[PDB]
Symmetry: D2
Subunit: 140 residues, 4 copies
Amino acid sequence: PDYFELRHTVGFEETNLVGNVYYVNYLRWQGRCRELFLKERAPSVLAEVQEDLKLFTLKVDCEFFAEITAFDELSIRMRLSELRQTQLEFTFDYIKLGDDGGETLVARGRQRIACMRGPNTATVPTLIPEALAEALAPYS
Amino acid sequence: PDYFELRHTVGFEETNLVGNVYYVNYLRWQGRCRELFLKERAPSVLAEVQEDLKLFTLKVDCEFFAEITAFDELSIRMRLSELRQTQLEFTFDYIKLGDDGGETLVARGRQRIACMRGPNTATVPTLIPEALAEALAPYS
Amino acid sequence: PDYFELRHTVGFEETNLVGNVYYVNYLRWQGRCRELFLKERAPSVLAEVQEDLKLFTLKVDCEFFAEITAFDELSIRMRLSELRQTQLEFTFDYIKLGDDGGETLVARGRQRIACMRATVPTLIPEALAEALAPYS
Amino acid sequence: PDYFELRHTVGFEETNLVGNVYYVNYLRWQGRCRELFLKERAPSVLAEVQEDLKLFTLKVDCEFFAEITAFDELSIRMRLSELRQTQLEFTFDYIKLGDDGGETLVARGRQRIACMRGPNTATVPTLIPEALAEALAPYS
């Protein structure tokens, strides 16, 4: 499809007092989708982050359209929004998989990431790694 | 004076493998500061949450200007940026407190909230509770 | 396999400052293993536990033997250690899968749950017991 | 008094859809109480662990006797149950603070920590740091 998919059933312990989901959990789901992409599409990046490659998070946000609860089936879909020189922006479509087959959008979020180089103290900008740029081809 | 403050030292477990802090943690702290203000300044609101009053987070965001490591002293400053009759927006300044007295803005977050009442099906908005609006006066 | 398996790869953000895994994450993985088991093996329980039934955790624990870091492949095996009329105990084996195919007992934990349904000490749901028959 | 206290109000987002508290949340609290202790009473330990010193958690557990919900006032009390030459055991008593001054033992958890030195494969038991042994003095 146009997106990278992360299937996730809403945990019983991922809800609040009034049955709704803690807004932080949505963002945890973003990281779980972003990291899963790097494990299956660009493992080359993963090893570089353990070295001197640092994927700085510039901005992350999320808007909530509908309230979800426990045991609701979700399809967190990631799409490449912007592709720049040393930066890139993702987009996360939180969709609820209804039993009938409906696909409603319960939330949407995006994440701005910059690529840097060198030690944590003295850093420098760097191009988006080739493997990562190629893996983001059908997901724009 | 201009803000409500949450004191926080960056945890040893809140720091990852390379010395960076997961952005999710910023939003966890942002959530704590939102409840500390309530439980202190407007405790009456919390009694209403268990009843009919519902607090809907419409949108959250956070921008990052610099990286931090464990044992960094943070001053999470919460101030009211936007005030409406049914909604409000909280701004969160993440001030990295220096040992010499310096103050470096390391991050900034925003949180749009909507005051709701009623059942799970038919939610209706409500005027911002008197005590909640009262406690927001010196933080405008 | 006499156990229920949950495959998990240690997240880059699940590690701490010195490159080790926060112990809280270990029990975080226990919940996901218990949840996943209930989902596939006894879906009737989940439909029962949300309105009246309550699976109350009496005791959780976890002892650690070795240390693991990011991207370490883990095979979390769950099995029924003790079965009773109102209570049941799970046991979780934390096995680090070597790059060649070797296996290492990194950690091991237990969870003690009492069935309740403001609550009433109730029988273990028959559907839950039948799904546990292999993993006894 | 005879323990290290961490006051904590049960969060609205820490409680699930049935009114109970996730058992994982209990352990983050005692881990927070542990880190806050090392932060306040023995900061030297927090710097040595970044080198060759290791605070290896041998075993951790927690027993639950009651049910708590949102906005409950808790008093987490950390004591020293056992101290060896290289090992130590903490005991966490979760005390629910009532409005009428009543106190109730809600839960109890413990944690065994082994002090070791050197790289992961060359790990060897080491004596408790003098800063830590001095910090555990008012628990004798």
